[PDB]
Amino acid sequence: KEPCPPLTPRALVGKWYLRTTSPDIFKQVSNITEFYSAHGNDYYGTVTDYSPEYGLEAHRVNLTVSGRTLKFYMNDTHEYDSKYEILAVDKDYFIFYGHPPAAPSGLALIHYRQSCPKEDVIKRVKKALKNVCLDYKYFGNDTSVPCHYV
Ligand SMILES: *[C@@H]1O[C@H](CO)[C@@H](O)[C@H](O)[C@H]1NC(C)=O
Ligand SMILES: *[C@@H]1O[C@H](CO)[C@@H](O)[C@H](O)[C@H]1NC(C)=O
Ligand SMILES: *[C@@H]1O[C@H](CO)[C@@H](O)[C@H](O)[C@H]1NC(C)=O
């Protein structure tokens, strides 16, 4: 579903885990960690992930930021290369939406500071998604990350 959209400098600086998407991408990919550095108003970074075909891998990335849109470019796989709009941004999480080749009709992505986001964060994420006409129950999550015992 297309949202109804509503970025300070340096807000994506740091380590993030991409644990939730709509539609779900986590049958094709897992364990996505990102590290972003700020370069004035842009970012350059590393993503690491597990791939069924490549195993544990890394990508160099550039975020070229232009108001509320940005263009994500990766070095060696172009399937997630797109303009992304920021839907929500917080201390603990950020949400963006784009239309890469992997998901031409729309891909929403939630990145979190924590590896296993708790109820404190998940309640904010849900309210955030409702303010932009999306709904958390249509998101899939990274069920290969162990976040609970048994
Ligand atoms: C998951 O990602 C981290 C890198 O953030 C890595 O250290 C670890 O090996 C990975 N686990 C699996 C099972 O891929
Ligand atoms: C893309 O960039 C990363 C990080 O610098 C590098 O480790 C990775 O292997 C590159 N991919 C290829 C196919 O060269
Ligand atoms: C996946 O979802 C459930 C709740 O929907 C949560 O308890 C679990 O930790 C989540 N996995 C993540 C975010 O890694």
Author numbering: 1 to 6, 11 to 154
From the paper:
Diploptera punctata, also known as the Pacific beetle cockroach, is a viviparous cockroach that gives birth to live offspring and secretes a highly concentrated mixture of glycosylated proteins as a source of nourishment for developing embryos. The principal component of this milk is lipocalin-like proteins or Lili-Mips. Lili-Mip has a lipocalin fold and binds to different fatty acids and other moieties. Lili-Mip is small (18.8 kDa), monomeric, and glycosylated.
The intrinsic tryptophan fluorescence change was employed to determine the binding affinity of different fatty acids to Lili-Mip1. Fatty acids of varying chain lengths (14, 16, and 18) and degrees of unsaturation (0, 1, and 2) were assayed. All tested fatty acids bound with micromolar range affinities to the different Lili-Mips. Binding studies with Lili-Mip1 against palmitic acid were performed at different pH values to verify whether the fatty acid binding affinity was pH-dependent. The data showed that Lili-Mip1 had no change in binding affinity for palmitic acid between pH 4.8 and 8.2(KD’s at pH 4.8, 7.2, and 8.2 for Palmitic acid are 1.76± 0.93; 0.44±0.20; 2.24±0.11 μM respectively). Deglycosylated Lili-Mip1 showed a marginal decrease in stability. However, the removal of glycans did not affect the pH-dependent change in the thermal stability of Lili-Mip1. In various crystal structures (reported here and previously by us), Phe-98 and Phe-100 occupy multiple conformations in the binding pocket. Here we show Phe-98 and Phe-100 can reorient to stabilize interactions at the bottom of the cavity–and change the volume of the cavity from 510 Å3 to 337 Å3. The different conformations of Phe-98 and Phe-100 allow Lili-Mips to bind fatty acids of different lengths, thereby explaining the broad substrate tolerance of Lili-Mips.
